[PDB]
């Protein structure tokens, strides 16, 4: 009988399928003129119209190429692969969708760029200093989590104009530090000094060649030389297969986009590279400083981690700009950089623990939603995004992509990575939505019998003011017959009111201020749910009274979004791990928890019963978190084992509990140890005590 | 939306000269005419020995748009010795900065260095020149015995600048006491007064001046833009400044007094880095008399529909109100790194409809990043956020950006006609481009049939060609139209008339006119003036019976009417617009005459009913609420029937339902025509007789405050007819409830203590918390989760304070969170234990010596909490129990409550009551194994 296909897509071909995927037609007058167009497939099969006829085409995902995932990353010989399937092929019929998956893995041995970048203010000679030994000192420690490394330098002091820079009050003070009883080297703005090379001795050598400058000005032009590092990565070196870190290091406040205009520097960042043969930045002087927005596409387009090494009297300053630049990272500098090392190595675990997907070049009329599997087999959905992680993990996310209508007739490519990575998975899409007897079809009046109309797949429309299954009635004037199967039932309604029953089809004769199809005049364009003044919220295109939503948006009335940052908490965690993602807004599970991001929940149980499960998991291999296994992922915080707890005049928390052996565990914990927790246990828990009188 | 983008004047400097970068209207009293001052910062000029001094230019309007410069300076640098220059002209900027009022105009070389007359220096002091006429004057505020970056060395004075009505000048000096900023003010005659070329410190005797703060605010900025305009009350221009580094680069905007320096009022952006502050505009685009403030952040990031920071940028708009307060509001830009807060222009009314409109410019958006221009209409509500047009930028670029936008001026009509115009720069290209307005015109068309019910069988004209008669009525179009401004009388209009209009589309065509037999017909039209209310008639004919067969749609008249462009223009090709709110067309409809019995009339019986679906809406949050209405007409058909249902706009309308065959599904629509608070549903234009439907109309209402005791609904059905064309207007109530789903819940961080106590003895007099026991919390939390509010409650917790004459849990102190006092009955911390540096089993108030809690808990609101702290100490001492060992005991507190008030005190209430108990259960674990018949000893 009549179903959505019939209704809706008995126009043509092109209607048949624009209806749905459930849609097919038939070709060569199968069943010449008989009754039933389009309905479903199944129905229209039933009814002989079957061979070279059918026309359903189905929607695919064929993967092109997929090369296995890696086990090292040194190990080359074969190409190191981190994304399963790299190339996959897309054919989406209109209103239809196709789900696929993507496996991302922290690849083992993987080699690492690192681009040392330096504030060389008069400040920083203390830490030149210190920063000899590193070097050899870093490539033995690096040794560890990587095989092929190899690190570069390059120094920063702000432009060398005239606000900033010491005009030149004296010429003696071009060659500035006369004015206290010594010597610094003029300003200079940027200054790459090494391209990364393999040979770690180098860098030792060349950090002892350099000196110091000054500046009058206490905010210094650090984002030319993060901009230039960045997008000069021919100078700079950066490989394709390695981690590329950007150690970002100053003791100062940063200049930024717009402070050029009072040094008459009114260009904006063009964003290409200006570091020639005498390796200095020679925009410095002419084009003005990058902003966030800026720096943030072209770290993202080369793969760089900006790692922020700023000292303590200016660290809350780049953690907020850290924060509107997502995947950088900030650590606590020494006056010296005594412990540049460390930040560095910390920096990397950091950046490797987490796996977050990309997409560029999506098109417009298509939308993907995500779910992420990172624990076990555990499926989060909503979630492109995957954190915790150690090097050797491999994390899965699931991809469904749907198109609304039918798009260009052009086969689009689009591609989805993971930050920072250089593997991805590249999407063709081809948009099926055009029957194959559409072009061998000629209307020229002729052909759809004794008359004048237009002719095409097994059927014909009459050209204006005509139609009938044939070919006849212009315009009224015959009219009075035919009558036709018009409204389902035959209880007397004509054409949904809004429309005439003529020559066995409906006259849809209302233009209201939009469109009007459907052949009972089915459907309105325009009459739909309203959430507030817009049509879909403003956020969507309708067809018969239903809401088609825009990309990022779902639900009855298109207000719901698919946002999750809304979500986040600078904890980094979801809804505070206590909670689901509703619209971009947190629904508070049972913990009787609350705020914007679950965040609050004073009546929660202390942090010891959360620890002491970790505990019993991690040091006595029982517990909830043992038999989920989830113990290695849900805590990473360093358990050590002392034989006594202290009074220490710090930050002490005495958690007490009786294990299933009966006995009392009783262990201390410690945050803020420099923005990390250890947790230390009392190596010999109480227990009862049998007879050992001597026995 | 009506600046003239077809024919806008154009104007260039030289190239490389930032011509455009800043520009200005000169309007003086000494002449009938009126110029445009651009400046050109990097112009080189015929001073001696100074490359790129830059200039100002005077840009004739009256035809040729040559620029002549504007000679303020024409000497090279002075000397402080002979070969030793006091000062350096060249690279100086001058005319990055251009301001006039009346005769007078202001230019500054905000990059001016300046040698010291103490050290050797070069120091950007920034100066300025003050024109009027021949006679000019220096004023270089910043050039004082205050000498280096610490002082106003590092001034750049002159980088922005301002006018007050009055006359006093607003500097802008962002680099005064190491970056700060600076804000300075002077007379004008005080200036041109003192003025003294032989003394280059002059000091001005009413000057206002910021003066030097503390080294946080360091590098803040102040002075990068500024803009005048009364604030405190009434009196004089206060001044308004953007400080871009402010608050570790959120950025601020300083407001100061007029009279005096004195600080009024601060802003604050959201986002670091975003360079709030950047541009500042003061305008009342509210037309209430009170300057409203547009604060621009060009590097904004908002945040796209994937959830990804993207940098479109920012302007804030503060509609100020007699109060203080003011009321704002955001402005997102449109691409990304178009930098959208980049200018903020006053306009003035640009379409003289009552308010003030602003242009906000993104100089390096577009299609090839040539640059926009928004305009942006103001309402009695505020800026209208929509913008009604966009100036697309029109050169390319060289190399550097054409930046076209970066520089602005509106609020003066350089022509005739009664309109504001526009400059916009372009520096990147060397060009400014004056945009002029066009005049808007308003146009009330009028349409009526006169036989509005058309008779088939009443054929009283005569057809003109043949000798038979037909079924005709009468067509009557009309056009009033008036407009402000200088415009002319005489007004042509493309009129079209078109019968039948929702029939034409393939099918057949009812009515046609009599002379052309022919649906469709034009006439050229030529109205004037306003208010002479032109009119045209036509007399159309119906088909014969014989087989146009539809005789129950409407026969719509539609009628619309276009302006003729070139005929109507004045001399320089000024083509008036019409008013953009103002359709160009109406419909009216004639239904043919069917049924309405014998007489000939149509006299329907319109009905309307409802019933209360759910009978509650709970007040403090949205609401779902559906009614079923029953329309039904059960007297003759009613022509253009539909149902009014006006709804009390402190409720929204989702939709019809269409969950259910059983309801109707009509075509409705939401409106509002002034006053009016309505749904409009269509029951069909011939509602013919007896036929009643069923509906369902779904809203939500949102009524949080405690306004009436229900919210009503008034719903009448209406026709077209000439009799009995409405029902009765009915009413319904819906009744609005009380409910507050209040909770107590507590707990105890230490919610067990095991008694091997570490590291304890007894102390006879003991002092700290580590000589009595362990710290065990008790946290209580009092929290409304329902919809409506409460006023007032009351919380009693009842502590278990000792066991016989033995103190088990010992307060120390305790803590509250929100709306609520507490007191306890018994002294807290009797024995002065300070440190912080922050029936066997069960022991209760029962059987346990009770300390009691009272808290008066105020006005808790949906999603809120009251949370009561008590930090208690173990009395250890006790649990050694010298009776004999030990037992497990259960310490157990208890916290209950009562609510005693509510908000909505002429609504039917209830009081709350609920309680918890939280418990600290002390064991010890560590027990005696089996032993026969011996005793313990200390
Ligand atoms: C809009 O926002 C802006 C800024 O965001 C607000 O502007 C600020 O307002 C503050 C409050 O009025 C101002 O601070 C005051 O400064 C004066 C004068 O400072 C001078 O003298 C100081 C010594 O007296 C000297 O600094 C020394 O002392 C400092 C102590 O603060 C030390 O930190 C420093 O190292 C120095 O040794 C300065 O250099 C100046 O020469 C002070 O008198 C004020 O003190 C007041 O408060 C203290 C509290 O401890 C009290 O004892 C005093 O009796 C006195 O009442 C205060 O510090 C600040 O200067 C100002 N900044 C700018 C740039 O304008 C603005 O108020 C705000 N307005 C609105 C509408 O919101
Ligand atoms: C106002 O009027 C002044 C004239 O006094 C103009 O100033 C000079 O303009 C020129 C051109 O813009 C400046 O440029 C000079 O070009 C040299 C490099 O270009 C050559 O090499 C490139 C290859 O890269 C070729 O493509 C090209 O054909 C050239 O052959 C520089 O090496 C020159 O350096 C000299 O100037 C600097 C300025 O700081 C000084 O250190 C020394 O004098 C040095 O010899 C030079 O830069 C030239 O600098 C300008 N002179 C100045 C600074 O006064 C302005 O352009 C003009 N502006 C306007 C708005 O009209
Ligand atoms: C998109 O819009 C729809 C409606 O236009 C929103 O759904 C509405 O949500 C309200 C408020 O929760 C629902 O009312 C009631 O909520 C209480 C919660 O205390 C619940 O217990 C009741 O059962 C009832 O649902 C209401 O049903 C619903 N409106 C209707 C009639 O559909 C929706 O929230 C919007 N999406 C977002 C989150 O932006
Ligand atoms: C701290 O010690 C107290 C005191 O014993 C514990 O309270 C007891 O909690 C248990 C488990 O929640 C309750 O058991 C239940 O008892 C009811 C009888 O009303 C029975 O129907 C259930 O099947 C169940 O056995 C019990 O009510 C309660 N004590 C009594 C006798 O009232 C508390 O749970 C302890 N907390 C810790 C740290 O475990
Ligand atoms: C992520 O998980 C959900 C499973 O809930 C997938 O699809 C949803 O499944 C059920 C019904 O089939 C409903 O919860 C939703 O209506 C479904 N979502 C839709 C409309 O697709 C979802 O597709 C999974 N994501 C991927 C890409 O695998
Ligand atoms: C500058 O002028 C303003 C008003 O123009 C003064 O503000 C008032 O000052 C008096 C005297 O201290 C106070 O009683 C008022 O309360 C102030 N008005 C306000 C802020 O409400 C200000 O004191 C003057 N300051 C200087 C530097 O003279
Ligand atoms: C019969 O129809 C004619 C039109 O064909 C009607 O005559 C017009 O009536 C309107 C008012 O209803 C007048 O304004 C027109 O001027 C009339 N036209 C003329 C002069 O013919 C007429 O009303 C109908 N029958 C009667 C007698 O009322
Ligand atoms: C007659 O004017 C109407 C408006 O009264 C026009 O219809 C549409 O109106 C919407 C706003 O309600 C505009 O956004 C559209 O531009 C209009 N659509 C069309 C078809 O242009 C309409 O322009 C006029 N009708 C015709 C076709 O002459
Ligand atoms: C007080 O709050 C309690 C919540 O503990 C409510 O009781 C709940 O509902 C039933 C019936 O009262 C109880 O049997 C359950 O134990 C409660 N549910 C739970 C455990 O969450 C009760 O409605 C309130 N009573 C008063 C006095 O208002
Ligand atoms: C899509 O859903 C899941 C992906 O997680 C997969 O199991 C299933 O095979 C896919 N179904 C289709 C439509 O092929
Ligand atoms: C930066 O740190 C965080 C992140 O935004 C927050 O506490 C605060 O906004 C910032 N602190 C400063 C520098 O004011
Ligand atoms: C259409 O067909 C008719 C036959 O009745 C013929 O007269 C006419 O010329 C044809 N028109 C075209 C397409 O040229
Ligand atoms: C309408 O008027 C114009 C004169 O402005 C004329 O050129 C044109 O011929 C007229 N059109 C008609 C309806 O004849
Ligand atoms: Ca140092
Ligand atoms: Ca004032
Ligand atoms: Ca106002
Ligand atoms: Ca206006
Ligand atoms: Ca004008
Ligand atoms: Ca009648």
Redesign the interface.
């Known amino acids: 009988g009549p179903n959505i296909c019939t209704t809706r897509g008995v126009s043509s071909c092109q209607q048949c399928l624009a209806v749905s995927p459930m849609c097919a037609w038939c070709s060569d007058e199968a069943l010449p003129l008989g009754s039933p167009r389009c309905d479903l497939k199944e129905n229209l099969l039933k009814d002989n119209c079957a061979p070279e006829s059918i026309e359903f085409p189905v929607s695919e995902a064929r993967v092109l190429e997929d090369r296995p995932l890696s086990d090292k990353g040194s190990g080359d010989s074969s190409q190191v692969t981190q994304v399963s399937p790299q190339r996959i092929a897309l054919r989406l019929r209109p209103d239809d969708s196709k789900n696929f998956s993507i496996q991302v893995r922290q690849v083992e041995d993987y080699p690492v760029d690192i681009y040392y970048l330096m504030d060389l203010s008069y400040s920083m000679k203390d830490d030149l200093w210190s920063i000899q030994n590193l070097g050899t000192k870093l490539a033995t420690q690096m040794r560890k989590l990587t095989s092929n490394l190899r690190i570069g330098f390059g120094a920063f002091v702000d432009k060398p104009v005239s606000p900033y820079m010491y005009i030149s009050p004296p010429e003696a003070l071009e060659n500035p530090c006369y004015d206290m009883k010594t010597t610094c080297l003029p300003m200079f703005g940027y200054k790459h000094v090494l391209t990364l090379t393999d040979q770690v001795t180098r860098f030792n050598e060349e950090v002892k060649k350099q000196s110091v400058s000054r500046n009058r000005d206490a905010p210094e032009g650090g984002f030319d030389a993060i901009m230039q590092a960045t997008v000069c990565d021919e100078k700079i070196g950066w490989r394709n297969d390695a981690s590329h870190l950007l150690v970002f290091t100053t003791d100062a406040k940063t200049h930024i986009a717009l402070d050029g205009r009072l040094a008459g520097i009114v260009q904006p960042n063009d964003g290409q590279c200006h570091v020639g043969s005498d390796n200095h930045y020679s925009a410095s002087t002419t084009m003005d400083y990058p902003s966030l927005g800026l720096m943030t596409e072209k770290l993202s387009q080369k793969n760089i981690n900006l790692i922020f090494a700023v000292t303590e009297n200016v660290v809350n300053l780049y953690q907020n700009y850290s924060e509107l630049i997502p995947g950088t990272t900030v650590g606590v500098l020494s006056m010296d950089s005594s412990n540049v090392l460390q930040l560095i190595v910390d920096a990397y675990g950091k950046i490797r623990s987490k796996v977050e997907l990309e997409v560029r070049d999506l098109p417009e009329e298509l939308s993907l939603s995500f779910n992420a599997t990172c624990l076990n087999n555990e499926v989060i959905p909503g979630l492109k995004s995957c954190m915790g992680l150690k090097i050797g993990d491999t994390v899965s996310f699931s991809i469904e992509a749907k198109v609304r209508g039918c798009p260009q007739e052009k086969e689009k490519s689009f591609t989805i990575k993971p930050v920072g990575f250089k593997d991805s998975l590249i999407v063709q899409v081809t948009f099926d939505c055009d029957c194959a007897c559409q072009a061998q079809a000629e209307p020229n009046s002729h052909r759809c019998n004794n008359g004048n109309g237009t002719f095409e797949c097994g059927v014909c429309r009459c050209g204006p003011g005509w139609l009938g299954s044939q070919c006849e009635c212009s315009e009224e004037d015959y009219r009075p017959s035919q009558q036709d199967e018009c409204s389902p039932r035959e209880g007397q309604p004509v054409c949904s009111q809004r429309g005439e029953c003529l020559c066995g089809q409906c006259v849809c004769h209302s233009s209201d201020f939009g469109k009007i199809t459907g052949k009972y005049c089915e459907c309105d364009d325009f009459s739909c749910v309203r959430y507030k003044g817009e049509m879909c919220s403003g956020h969507g295109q309708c067809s018969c009274g239903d809401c088609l939503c825009d990309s990022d948006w779902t639900g009855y009335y298109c207000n719901c979004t698919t946002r999750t940052d809304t979500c986040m908490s600078s904890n980094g965690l979801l809804c505070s791990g206590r909670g689901k993602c509703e619209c971009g807004s947190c629904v508070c599970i049972q913990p009787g928890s609350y705020g914007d991001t679950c965040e609050k929940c004073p009546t929660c149980p202390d942090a010891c019963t959360f620890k002491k499960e970790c505990v019993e998991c991690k040091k006595f291999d029982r517990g909830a978190l043992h038999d989920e296994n989830t113990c290695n992922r849900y805590c990473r915080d360093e358990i050590e084992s002392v034989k006594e707890l202290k009074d220490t005049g710090k930050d002490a928390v005495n958690c007490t509990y009786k294990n299933e052996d009966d006995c009392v565990v009783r262990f201390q914990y410690y945050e803020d140890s420099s923005g990390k927790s250890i947790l230390y246990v009392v190596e010999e828990p109480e227990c009862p005590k049998g007879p050992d009188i001597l026995v | 939306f009506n600046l003239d983008v077809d024919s806008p004047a154009e104007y260039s400097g030289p190239e490389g000269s930032?011509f455009g970068?800043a520009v200005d209207f000169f309007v003086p009293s000494a002449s009938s005419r009126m110029f445009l001052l651009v400046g050109a910062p990097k112009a080189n000029t015929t001073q001696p020995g100074i490359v790129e001094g830059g200039q100002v230019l005077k840009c004739d309007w009256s035809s040729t748009r040559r620029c002549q410069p504007i000679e303020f300076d024409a000497t090279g640098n002075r000397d402080y010795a002979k070969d030793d220059p006091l000062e350096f002209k060249s690279?100086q900027?001058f005319g990055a900065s251009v301001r006039s009022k009346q005769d007078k105009i202001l230019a500054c070389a905000p990059?001016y260095?300046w040698r010291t007359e103490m050290?050797?220096?070069?120091?950007?002091v920034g100066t300025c020149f003050l024109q009027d006429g021949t006679k000019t004057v220096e004023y270089a505020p910043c050039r004082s015995q205050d000498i280096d970056?610490d002082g106003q060395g590092?001034c750049?004075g002159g980088?922005s600048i301002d006018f007050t009505k009055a006359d006093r000048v607003l500097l802008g000096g962002?680099?005064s006491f190491?970056?700060q900023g600076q804000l300075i003010s002077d007379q004008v005659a005080e200036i041109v007064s003192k003025y003294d070329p032989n003394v280059y410190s002059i000091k001005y005797n009413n000057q206002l001046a910021t003066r030097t703060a503390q080294a946080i605010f360091?590098?803040s900025?102040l002075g990068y833009s500024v803009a005048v305009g009364d604030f405190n009350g009434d009196g004089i221009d206060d001044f308004v400044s953007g400080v871009?580094?402010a608050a570790?680069?959120l950025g601020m905007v300083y407001i100061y007094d007029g009279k005096n320096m004195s600080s009024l009022y601060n802003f604050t952006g959201e986002?670091?880095?975003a360079?709030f502050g950047?541009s500042v505009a003061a305008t009342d685009i509210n037309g209430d008399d009170y300057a409203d403030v547009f604060i621009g952040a060009?590097?904004f990031?908002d945040?796209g529909?994937?959830?990804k920071?993207?940098?479109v940028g920012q302007v804030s708009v503060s509609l100020q109100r007699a109060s203080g307060d003011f009321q704002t509001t955001k402005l997102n830009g449109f691409e990304?790194?178009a930098?959208f807060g980049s200018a903020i222009a006053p306009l003035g009314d640009l379409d003289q409809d009552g308010f003030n409109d602003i242009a906000i410019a993104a100089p390096?958006g577009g299609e090839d990043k040539k640059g926009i221009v928004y305009i942006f209409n103001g309402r009695s509500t505020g800026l209208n956020a929509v913008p009604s047009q966009i100036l697309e930028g029109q050169w390319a670029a060289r190399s550097?950006?054409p930046?076209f936008g970066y520089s602005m001026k509106g609020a003066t009509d350089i022509d005739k006609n009664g309109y504001p115009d526009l400059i916009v720069g372009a520096?990147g290209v060397d060009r400014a481009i004056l945009y002029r307005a066009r005049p808007v015109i308003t146009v009330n068309a009028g349409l009526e049939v006169y036989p509005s019910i058309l008779n088939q069988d009443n054929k009283t004209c005569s057809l003109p060609g043949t000798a038979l008669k037909v079924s005709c009525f009468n067509v009557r179009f009309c056009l009033k139209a008036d407009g402000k401004g200088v415009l002319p009388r005489k007004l042509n209009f493309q009129v079209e008339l078109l019968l039948d209009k929702?029939?034409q589309?393939?099918?057949?065509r009812r009515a046609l006119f009599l002379y052309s037999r022919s649906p469709s017909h034009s006439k050229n039209m030529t109205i004037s003036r306003g208010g002479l209310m032109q009119c045209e008639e036509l007399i159309a004919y119906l088909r014969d019976e014989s087989?146009?067969?539809?005789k129950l749609?409407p026969i719509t008249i539609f009628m619309e009417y276009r302006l003729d462009y070139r005929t109507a223009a004045d001399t320089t090709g000024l083509q008036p617009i019409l008013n953009q709110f103002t359709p160009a067309n109406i419909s009216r409809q004639a239904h043919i005459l069917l049924d309405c019995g014998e007489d000939n009339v149509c006299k329907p019986k319109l009905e309307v009913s409802v019933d209360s679906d759910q009978k509650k809406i709970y007040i403090g949050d949205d609401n779902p609420l559906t009614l079923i209405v029953k329309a039904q007409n059960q007297g003759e058909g009613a022509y253009e029937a539909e149902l009014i249902v006006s709804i009390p706009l402190q409720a929204?309308?989702?939709?019809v339902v269409?969950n259910n065959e059983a309801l109707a599904r009509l075509?409705?629509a939401?409106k509002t025509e002034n006053q009016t608070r309505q749904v409009v549903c269509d029951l069909?234009n011939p509602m013919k007789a007896g036929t009643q439907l069923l509906a369902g109309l779904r809203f939500s209402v949102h009524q949080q405050s405690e306004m009436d005791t229900s919210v009503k609904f008034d719903l009448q059905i209406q026709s077209s007819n000439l009799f009995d064309k409405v029902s009765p207007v009915v009413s319904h109530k819906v009744d609005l409830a009380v409910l507050a789903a209040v909770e107590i819940?507590?707990?105890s961080?230490?919610?067990?203590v095991?008694l091997?106590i570490?590291?304890w003895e007894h102390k006879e007099n003991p002092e700290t918390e580590?000589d009595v026991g362990?710290v065990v919390?008790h946290?209580y939390?009092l929290?409304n989760n329902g919809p409506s509010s409460f006023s007032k409650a009351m919380l009693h917790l009842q502590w278990p304070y000792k066991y016989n004459n033995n103190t088990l849990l010992y307060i120390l102190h305790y803590d509250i969170?929100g709306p609520m006092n507490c007191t306890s009955d018994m002294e807290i911390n009797p024995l002065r234990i300070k440190i912080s540096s922050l029936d066997i089993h069960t022991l209760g108030c029962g059987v346990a010596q009770c300390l009691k809690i009272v808290c008066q808990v105020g006005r808790l609101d949906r999603?809120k909490?009251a949370?009561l702290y008590v930090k208690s100490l173990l009395w250890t001492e006790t649990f050694m129990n010298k009776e004999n060992q030990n037992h497990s005991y259960s310490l157990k507190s208890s916290a209950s409550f009562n609510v005693i008030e509510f908000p909505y005190k002429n609504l039917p209430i209830e009081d709350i009551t609920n309680s918890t108990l939280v418990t600290t259960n002390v064991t010890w674990?560590?027990?005696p194994?089996p032993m026969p018949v011996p005793v313990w000893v200390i």
């Open positions: 930032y970068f690279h900027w990059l260095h050290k050797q220096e070069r120091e950007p970056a590092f750049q980088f962002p680099g190491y970056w360091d590098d900025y871009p580094r570790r680069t986002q670091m880095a360079y950047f060009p590097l990031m945040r529909s994937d959830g920071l993207q940098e990304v790194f930098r390096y550097m950006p930046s520096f929702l029939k589309k393939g099918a057949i087989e146009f067969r539809d749609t929204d309308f989702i939709g269409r075509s409705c939401f069909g819940r507590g707990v961080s230490p919610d067990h095991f091997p570490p590291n580590e362990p919390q946290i939390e929290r969170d999603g909490s949370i674990g560590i027990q194994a």
